[PDB]
């Protein structure tokens, strides 16, 4: 019913945008922490590795740290970030 903008937990409705700085889908947030959309969620949201934003529902989150400077998230070596699995609010894909 309402969009979460921080303190994401499973069940939350979230706004997901194709970020220009990272060339990757991220959750819109006022938090200083990075929340990336997990690559496995792209087909559930009708996205491709090019829609600009989508609403999603949080199913899972995983706290991660970059081990390589050159990675899929374009974050510096050692950056920590969450990876978030999401699905559409009401469509089974």
């Amino acid at each position: 019913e309402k969009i979460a903008i921080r303190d994401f937990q499973v069940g939350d409705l979230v706004l997901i945008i194709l970020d220009e700085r990272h060339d990757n889908y991220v959750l819109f947030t006022v938090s200083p922490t990075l929340y990336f959309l997990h690559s496995e969620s792209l087909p559930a949201l009708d996205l491709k590795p090019r829609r600009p934003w989508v609403l999603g529902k949080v199913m899972e989150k995983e706290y991660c740290q970059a081990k390589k400077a050159q990675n899929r998230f374009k974050v510096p070596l050692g950056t920590k970030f969450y990876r978030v699995k999401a699905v559409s609010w009401n469509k089974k894909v």
């Binding site: 995983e62 706290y63 991660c64 740290q65 970059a66 081990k67 390589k68 990675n71 899929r72 998230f73 920590k80």
Partner: peptide, 7 residues
């Protein structure tokens, strides 16, 4: 993954 690890 070699790119990142779970903390």
């Amino acid at each position: 993954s070699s790119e990142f690890e779970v903390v």
